[PDB]
Design a protein around this ligand. Structure first.
Ligand SMILES: Nc1ncnc2c1ncn2[C@@H]1O[C@H](COP(=O)(O)OP(=O)(O)O)[C@@H](O)[C@H]1O
Ligand SMILES: Nc1ncnc2c1ncn2[C@@H]1O[C@H](COP(=O)(O)OP(=O)(O)O)[C@@H](O)[C@H]1O
Lengths: 93, 370, 370
């Protein structure tokens, strides 16, 4: 299920993915299993696109904050004045 | 000169005071204000009408003692100065404000008018040149050595479950519902009203608090132990008489976890702390589930923390590492933690100097306290 | 069905309801669940006790009022059904579900589960034969008559910028945040918690929300108006209790622009709106610049849209003609459009019949919603 998204304005977005899948349908007849095989492809497409849609949210928070946090651990504010003042926590922490 | 600083722990029920470096605040007495009752005509009595310590404990029912700090709200400012003066006296400090630095304590959500009012005291009436004031929870962290812990104090009318991480209490997660054993003992006086006894005098109520701190505990089973018939243990009256106890010793502290008994829309310390847990990093919660920092004087009951453990079990899910870290010298743990903090040398900056206070006062504090 | 169609203005903070043709919702009372606080003793004490409306506003101090629509999502489902029965009662509807056509409205980015559960109510408990769950932003466009507009709601637990095109928004360029004046006013109370005001009841907090709607605004200059010292204008409670206001009135709504005051993983609803507009074509963005629609109730602050204008000027590029429509029934704009669409008899195809539910449940709604 090869993908090649190429957005580039103000930050390159060269998104590429796929979905290596292998199913095994039974061949009875042409028109009988034709739509069945297409249905398998269809569901893998719908499912993977759905998975990617969910991946937007899960990566949006999980992957993001996992690599670069959104807010700090306290999530409040970073005041470097008080941070440099007294050596704000390297004493015990 | 920055002499030996004085770690002054302003605990809700009991205020503590002593020089840093020490392990015991040699000058302690509870947090009260004692004015007399009668009029001494003949001599042989003390003078001043503000009797603290051995005078107060001596002339308990002779003095109509009162309490300034009301859930962290103190109003006897002038008399507070006299209390400090009583400590400043030959009895306790024997020194001057200018001579020795002062490490005073605080609680969250306090009105800056009162905080800066205290600065007016120690910089105008008293003239402390090196005064720094801060929370007591961090002091308890110095005592435990832990840095990522949820501190909940237990005084007489103050209970703030503050979750701290590496010495950085998340204000969005800080919980301050300062109410404790004050009204619990008052409700126990209501039990005595439902037994025929009044303790309307503070000293009369002091005995109630003495037995409260003495003959009370936490029956982990709330309604199970509540519905069972008590034995009504006859406890000695100070004169020499004796009176029963009943469920009160465990029934009255149920109000701490069940605030609806007094009719208060609260949730019980444990749930409030779980709410503080909810406002943090999920992974840090597991540490904090095991980083149970106990603090305050009211953490002295049988099955206290264990009933609290049952609360956590009703709150926390499975496979959650729970670990109580109870201290022993609870109120002094914060005092010794202040002795640790005041011993720091980088510590000289954020304390408002006398000239610093002369500069702006209010905003100089605002910016130096934040 | 040949009856006047019911319009349901699903307001987060203040929910409303009404019919077709009308311009103001026929029956208005906010979204809340007022549970009791005491036990009946005297014959005359009402029963059911989970009262709404006159009894609620009347006996605020006697009803433990809670809120189901948390984050714009109802949690007290069954109770909200009964609130609709309260509407179905002699007070508001005086009719049945099966009689009048009904029209439900919605916010963007809503979970399907809520819509499904609502349909369960609508066709199982309630049995409306003519009903469909519509949107809210397009209804405000019906009110304005505009086509390519950005709709910004302003409730209590929901905030969404909906870039619409002729009443058909890009269901992707829309942004939605579930927070407004609820916790903002709670944070304002938190400002007062510092200065001693932790008056915890929701009805007690309803007064704080009356101040939110009354004594609050948005100062365009952030630090130039916040860091300075105010005059602290006073407020008087239902009895007339003197309480100063101060800077808090504009300090607290900065949370909507600076989520760091609460630590929310948002980035200022203004920037989120900018991003909602920026998820479309530049010329389409121009059309949206020309049509900026406001909804909800929190759009009633001084310097609200003005500070928003300043933020857009400091963030959006040049030539952005910020044409913000400022109507008055921003709360009812969604209701107005619901009455407009309710007047549109084309809804036959747009609705979901009872048998349509019998054959599809909510799948029919999900196939027809946009
Ligand atoms: N054994 C005890 N049982 C109950 N409460 C106690 C006991 N010992 C001390 N306390 C409470 O703690 C108060 C003093 O603690 P305090 O210094 O006020 O703690 P905090 O700093 O937590 O406010 C006393 O007034 C009392 O109510
Ligand atoms: N005059 C006002 N000033 C400021 N805020 C207001 C005013 N009137 C209402 N609000 C806010 O709008 C909210 C009403 O919610 P509502 O807008 O009905 O939700 P929705 O956005 O879903 O319609 C209230 O909670 C209140 O905080």
């Amino acid at each position: 299920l090869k993908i090649q998204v190429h957005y580039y304005e103000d930050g390159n977005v060269q998104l590429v993915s796929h979905k290596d899948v292998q199913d095994s349908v039974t061949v009875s007849n042409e028109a009988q299993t034709a739509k069945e095989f297409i249905k398998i492809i269809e569901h893998a497409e719908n499912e993977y696109q759905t998975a990617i849609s969910e991946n937007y949210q899960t990566m949006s928070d999980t992957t993001f904050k996992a690599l670069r946090r959104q807010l700090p651990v306290t999530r409040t504010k970073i005041d470097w004045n008080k941070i440099l003042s007294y050596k704000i926590g390297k004493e015990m922490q | 000169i920055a002499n030996q600083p004085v770690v002054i722990d302003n605990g809700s029920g009991v205020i503590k005071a002593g020089f840093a470096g020490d392990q015991i605040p040699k000058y302690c007495f509870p947090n009260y204000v004692g004015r007399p009752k009668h009029v001494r005509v003949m001599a042989g009595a003390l003078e001043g009408d503000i009797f603290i310590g051995p005078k107060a404990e001596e002339h308990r029912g002779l003095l109509s003692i009162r309490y300034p700090m009301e859930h962290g709200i103190v109003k006897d400012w002038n008399d507070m100065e006299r209390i400090w003066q009583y400590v400043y006296s030959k009895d306790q400090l024997q020194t001057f404000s200018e001579e020795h630095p002062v490490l005073l304590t605080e609680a969250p959500l306090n009105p800056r008018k009162n905080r800066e009012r205290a600065a007016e005291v120690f910089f105008e009436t008293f003239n402390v040149p090196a005064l720094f004031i801060s929370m007591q929870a961090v002091l308890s962290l110095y005592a435990t050595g832990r840095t990522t812990g949820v501190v909940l104090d237990s005084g007489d009318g103050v209970t703030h479950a503050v979750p701290i991480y590496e010495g950085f209490a998340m204000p969005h997660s800080i919980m301050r519902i300062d109410i404790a054993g004050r009204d619990v003992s008052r409700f126990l006086r209501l039990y005595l009203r439902k037994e025929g006894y009044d303790f309307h005098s503070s000293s009369e109520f002091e005995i109630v608090k003495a037995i409260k701190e003495r003959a009370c505990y936490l029956s982990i089973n709330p309604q199970k132990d509540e519905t069972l018939e008590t034995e009504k243990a006859q406890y000695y009256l100070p004169d020499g008489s004796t009176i029963e106890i009943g469920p009160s010793r465990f029934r009255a502290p149920e109000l701490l976890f069940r605030p609806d008994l007094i009719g208060e829309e609260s949730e019980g310390i444990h749930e409030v702390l779980v709410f503080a847990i909810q406002k943090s990093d999920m992974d840090l919660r597991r540490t904090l589930f095991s980083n149970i920092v106990l603090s305050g004087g009211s953490t002295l009951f049988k099955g206290f923390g264990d009933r609290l453990l049952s609360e956590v079990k009703k709150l926390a899910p499975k496979d959650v590492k729970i670990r109580i870290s109870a201290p022993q010298e609870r109120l002094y743990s914060t005092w010794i933690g202040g002795s640790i903090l005041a011993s720091l040398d980088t510590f000289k900056k954020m304390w408002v100097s006398k000239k610093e206070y002369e500069e702006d006062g209010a905003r100089s504090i605002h910016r130096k306290t934040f």
